[PDB]
Amino acid sequence: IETVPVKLKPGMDGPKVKQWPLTEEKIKALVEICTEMEKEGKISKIGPENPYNTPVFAIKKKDSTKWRKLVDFRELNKRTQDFHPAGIKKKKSVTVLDVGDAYFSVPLDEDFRKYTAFTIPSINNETPGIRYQYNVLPQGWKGSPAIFQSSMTKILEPFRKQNPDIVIYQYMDDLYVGSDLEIGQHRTKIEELRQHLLRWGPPFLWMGYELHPDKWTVQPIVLPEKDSWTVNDIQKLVGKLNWASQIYPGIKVRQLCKLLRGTKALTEVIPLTEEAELELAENREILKEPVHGVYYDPSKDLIAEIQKQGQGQWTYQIYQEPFKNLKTGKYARTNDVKQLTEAVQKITTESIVIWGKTPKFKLPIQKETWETWWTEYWQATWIPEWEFVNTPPLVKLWYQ
Amino acid sequence: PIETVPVKLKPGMDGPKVKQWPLTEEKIKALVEICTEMEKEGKISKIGPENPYNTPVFAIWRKLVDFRELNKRTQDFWEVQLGIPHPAGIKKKKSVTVLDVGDAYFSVPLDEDFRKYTAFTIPSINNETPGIRYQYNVLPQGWKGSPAIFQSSMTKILEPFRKQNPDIVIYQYMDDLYVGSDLEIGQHRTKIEELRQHLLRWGLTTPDKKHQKEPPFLWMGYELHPDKWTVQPIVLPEKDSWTVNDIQKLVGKLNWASQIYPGIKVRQLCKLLRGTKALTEVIPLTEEAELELAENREILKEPVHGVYYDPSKDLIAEIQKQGQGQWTYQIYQEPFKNLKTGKYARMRGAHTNDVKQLTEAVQKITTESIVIWGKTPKFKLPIQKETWETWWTEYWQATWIPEWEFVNTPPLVKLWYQLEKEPIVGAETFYVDAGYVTNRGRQKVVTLTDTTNQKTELQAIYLALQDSGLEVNIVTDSQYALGIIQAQPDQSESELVNQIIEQLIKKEKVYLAWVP
Numbered sequence: 001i002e003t004v005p006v007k008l009k010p011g012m013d014g015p016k017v018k019q020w021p022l023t024e025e026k027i028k029a030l031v032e033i034c035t036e037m038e039k040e041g042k043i044s045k046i047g048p049e050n051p052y053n054t055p056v057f058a059i060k061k062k063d064s065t066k067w068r069k070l071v072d073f074r075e076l077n078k079r080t081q082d083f084h085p086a087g088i089k090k091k092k093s094v095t096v097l098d099v100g101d102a103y104f105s106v107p108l109d110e111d112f113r114k115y116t117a118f119t120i121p122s123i124n125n126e127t128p129g130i131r132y133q134y135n136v137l138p139q140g141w142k143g144s145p146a147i148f149q150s151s152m153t154k155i156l157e158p159f160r161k162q163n164p165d166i167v168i169y170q171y172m173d174d175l176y177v178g179s180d181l182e183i184g185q186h187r188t189k190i191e192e193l194r195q196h197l198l199r200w201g202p203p204f205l206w207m208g209y210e211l212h213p214d215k216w217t218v219q220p221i222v223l224p225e226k227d228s229w230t231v232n233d234i235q236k237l238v239g240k241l242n243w244a245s246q247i248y249p250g251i252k253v254r255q256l257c258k259l260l261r262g263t264k265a266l267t268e269v270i271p272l273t274e275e276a277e278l279e280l281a282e283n284r285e286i287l288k289e290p291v292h293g294v295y296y297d298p299s300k301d302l303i304a305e306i307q308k309q310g311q312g313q314w315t316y317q318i319y320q321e322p323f324k325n326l327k328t329g330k331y332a333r334t335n336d337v338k339q340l341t342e343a344v345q346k347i348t349t350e351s352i353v354i355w356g357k358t359p360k361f362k363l364p365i366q367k368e369t370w371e372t373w374w375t376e377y378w379q380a381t382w383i384p385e386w387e388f389v390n391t392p393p394l395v396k397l398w399y400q
Numbered sequence: 401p402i403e404t405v406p407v408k409l410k411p412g413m414d415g416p417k418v419k420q421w422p423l424t425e426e427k428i429k430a431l432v433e434i435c436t437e438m439e440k441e442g443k444i445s446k447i448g449p450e451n452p453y454n455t456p457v458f459a460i461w462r463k464l465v466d467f468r469e470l471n472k473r474t475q476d477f478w479e480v481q482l483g484i485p486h487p488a489g490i491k492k493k494k495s496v497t498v499l500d501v502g503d504a505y506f507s508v509p510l511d512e513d514f515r516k517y518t519a520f521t522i523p524s525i526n527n528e529t530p531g532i533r534y535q536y537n538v539l540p541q542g543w544k545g546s547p548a549i550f551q552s553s554m555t556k557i558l559e560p561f562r563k564q565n566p567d568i569v570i571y572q573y574m575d576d577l578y579v580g581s582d583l584e585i586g587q588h589r590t591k592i593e594e595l596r597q598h599l600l601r602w603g604l605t606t607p608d609k610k611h612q613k614e615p616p617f618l619w620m621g622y623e624l625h626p627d628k629w630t631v632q633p634i635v636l637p638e639k640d641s642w643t644v645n646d647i648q649k650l651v652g653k654l655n656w657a658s659q660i661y662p663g664i665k666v667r668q669l670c671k672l673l674r675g676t677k678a679l680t681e682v683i684p685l686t687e688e689a690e691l692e693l694a695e696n697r698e699i700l701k702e703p704v705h706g707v708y709y710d711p712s713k714d715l716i717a718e719i720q721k722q723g724q725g726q727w728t729y730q731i732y733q734e735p736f737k738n739l740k741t742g743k744y745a746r747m748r749g750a751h752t753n754d755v756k757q758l759t760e761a762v763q764k765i766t767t768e769s770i771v772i773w774g775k776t777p778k779f780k781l782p783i784q785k786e787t788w789e790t791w792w793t794e795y796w797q798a799t800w801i802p803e804w805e806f807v808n809t810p811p812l813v814k815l816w817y818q819l820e821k822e823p824i825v826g827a828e829t830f831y832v833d834a835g836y837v838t839n840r841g842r843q844k845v846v847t848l849t850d851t852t853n854q855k856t857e858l859q860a861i862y863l864a865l866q867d868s869g870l871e872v873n874i875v876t877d878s879q880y881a882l883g884i885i886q887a888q889p890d891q892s893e894s895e896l897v898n899q900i901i902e903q904l905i906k907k908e909k910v911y912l913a914w915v916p
């Protein structure tokens with residue numbers, strides 16, 4: 001059994017990513033885990049000649065009390081040389097499977113191992129902190145799916161032809177299983193699969209729950225439909241309208257802005273003249289559907305922004321070009337951070353399903369906070385790219 | 401002996417070939433002795449004239465070899481050490497012994513394949529005569545990888561003894577080695593001599609009982625006992641004239657104290673630095689500056705000790721507002737049995753409010769704690785759940801505070817005002833743009849000078865607040881201003897803002913709206 005020559009992108013060197021400090025609870029887990037992975041030759045302690053580093057974390061699992069080790073190979077994958085059924089999204093149901101353990105059988109190119117260097121920190125720097133490196137294919141590394149693909153196909157080939165009514169899509173450490181069968185039959189069929197895996201030597205990702213892509217409908221823009229309309233209401237109305245005009249340029253306010261004739265009192269109730277009425281209705285009619293002409297191109301990055309609508313409600317939008325939204329949605333139901341993580345994850349899993357790639361996020365949260373608590377609720381095997389921002393005032397208004 | 405760590409030169413680069421500068425026959429002599437000794441010990445070895453590499457050597461006697469060229473061409477190693485532990489995190493010990501480790505690097509092999517690059521040359525006194533060539537077999541002092549490799553080794557050398565003596569704690573720091581236990585005075589001293597042997601069996605020589613340093617232990621600006629901790633002596637100068645440099649050095653020093661000496665304040669002093677033109681410029685101390693200094697020297701007059709972490713007991717953090725934008729806090733396990741204390745003066749962003757700031761405090765502390773005790777403390781905060789809750793569920797950014805209990809210790813943080821969620825009925829309506837026009841026919845166009853498109857949008861609003869009654873409705877087009885006020889700040893660097901904030905606090909009701 002020989003390994004596969006893998007190189008970093010030309011000229012690039014290995015990652016030297018700093019290890020965010022961990023809670024002795026997560027550290028203890030990691031220690032127990034890595035000790036074992038060591039006994040089983042999966043990993044090996046490394047010396048000082050390895051200056052590289054990737055962050056590790058410990059996360060919990062659904063339906064299990066066992067800790068899962070997560071390695072932020074985000075940077076490594078970005079320096080790794082290079083090497084999707086539109087039907088998955090159309091399926092009634094999709095269950096996610098963690099097949100990450102598959103890789104722990106295939107050895108990693110001897111000369112690439114040094115790049116998988118990661119560290120288990122120690123509290124209060126009371127000890128140098130254990131350093132390790134991978135021998136087999138690591139979970140979360142962009143290349144493992146690839147290198148293991150071959151074997152993965154041979155392993156699926158059977159169930160594939162036997163159960164052609166299914167759609168098996170793999171991504172990083174996850175396997176997405178799709179079908180339209182009635183949910184009852186589904187859960188039963190998933191099993192036959194995982195044993196057909198035990199057959200070659202596999203956890204439910206998320207819960208033992210299935211996503212239902214068939215109903216991920218885009219949350220359109222809406223306008224307040226109310227009885228009496230006050231000057232303020234009209235102003236808010238026009239404000240939201242003008243904004244939206246950027247997208248649907250068929251929006252006309254002329255008439256509504258006429259009701260705002262002069263310096264009236266905010267609470268004054270304005271009656272809507274026909275000209276205006278037919279204007280809103282029309283404007284209202286345009287927004288019922290997402291704008292035409294917005295197509296996704298693999299060529300570009302997928303961006304995702306989340307807005308806090310408070311009350312436990314959140315709003316997001318996925319686009320590539322501003323205003324040019326590919327999808328938009330909501331999320332409700334715990335503390336802020338817990339929710340946001342659940343959401344990101346939810347939005348990510350969605351992206352993978354629809355476009356087979358993770359989006360780049362913009363999180364309305366101070367970085368130190370995120371860094372501090374995200375692992376406390378994370379459950380996915382992957383990690384999107386993210387950046388932290390300051391949600392403008394109006395953006396939240398115009399949404400939800 | 402010990403496993404050799406394989407080294408390599410940076411990719412493409414080749415070994416050094418820098419010539420040996422000239423040397424006094426006096427120095428040649430001395431070096432040849434030093435080197436012949438080093439050759440006897442085996443640390444170095446004579447090499448054939450075919451080795452084209454070379455690193456300079458001069459004398460202090462003491463052989464000093466210039467490895468910067470080699471270092472520049474040597475691979476990067478795993479960082480020798482980011483953080484150092486912090487006293488508040490360590491545990492109480494009955495006995496703590498520091499072990500010096502003489503000639504550490506000299507006792508550690510060097511990747512054989514690398515040795516040829518360590519080649520240096522001893523000039524021949526007689527010029528007709530060619531000098532001797534040597535290369536290292538061990539970690540060369542002054543070489544890039546010596547620290548990292550030495551330490552690495554040390555660990556492996558320690559692992560065993562550590563397993564057999566789990567009831568013993570060892571922390572390696574550079575060339576010092578700290579060993580502590582809770583063994584009776586005598587048993588303790590014996591392990592020390594067991595260990596010393598362990599090290600000696602690896603050629604590592606340590607200081608005799610009669611010679612090792614004895615606590616308190618002066619470490620990284622601290623002063624450690626085996627039961628309590630503090631910071632080394634801290635003396636404030638008594639002086640007539642202060643120079644910015646003096647001022648700066650002083651403030652700097654005072655901060656260091658803040659980590660255990662609560663009540664330290666630098667406000668007035670830091671203030672003396674405004675507009676200064678030179679480090680050597682004398683600045684007279686304001687009355688308040690004098691006051692602050694005196695009070696500080698007072699606090700520093702009495703030593704205060706931090707206690708060590710008892711991982712058996714909970715961590716408790718308590719925070720207080722010690723002035724506008726100023727927070728104090730202290731983490732203890734045993735009621736008021738401080739492990740550590742500290743301040744927080746960071747205002748992130750031009751404007752804010754106590755709620756927002758108090759929370760940012762909590763995040764720093766949370767981060768600090770995880771780093772030190774690997775866990776977060778229960779917080780005791782001068783803010784009521786409701787208050788927080790309210791501000792929380794209305795703020796656009798997300799945030800989360802661990803388990804915390806309200807502490808009625810004034811000043812309690814609160815929000816000095818809130819914008820009506822709805823336009824106000826029967827309240828005059830001001831349309832601003834530099835002036836305003838109201839639904840009730842009033843107007844006040846005022847032209848400001850030395851302004852900004854932004855400070856002007858802010859001005860309008862202000863005027864409006866001023867001239868308006870107890871309840872006002874305000875319509876602005878400035879998204880900017882909107883964001884700021886909408887954020888409900890209670891403090892800002894901008895005076896205008898503070899003028900406005902003041903205004904806002906006064907109103908009975910205020911509704912601010914935006915339009916293009």
Ligand SMILES: CC[C@H]1C(=O)Nc2ccc(F)cc2N1C(=O)OC(C)C
Pocket residue numbers: 126485487490491492493496569570571573578579580617619624625626627708
């Ligand atoms: C070795 C025991 C360890 C510890 O748990 N408590 C103490 C108490 C007093 C000391 F002087 C040292 C230390 N220790 C430590 O790691 O000291 C480094 C900061 C130098």
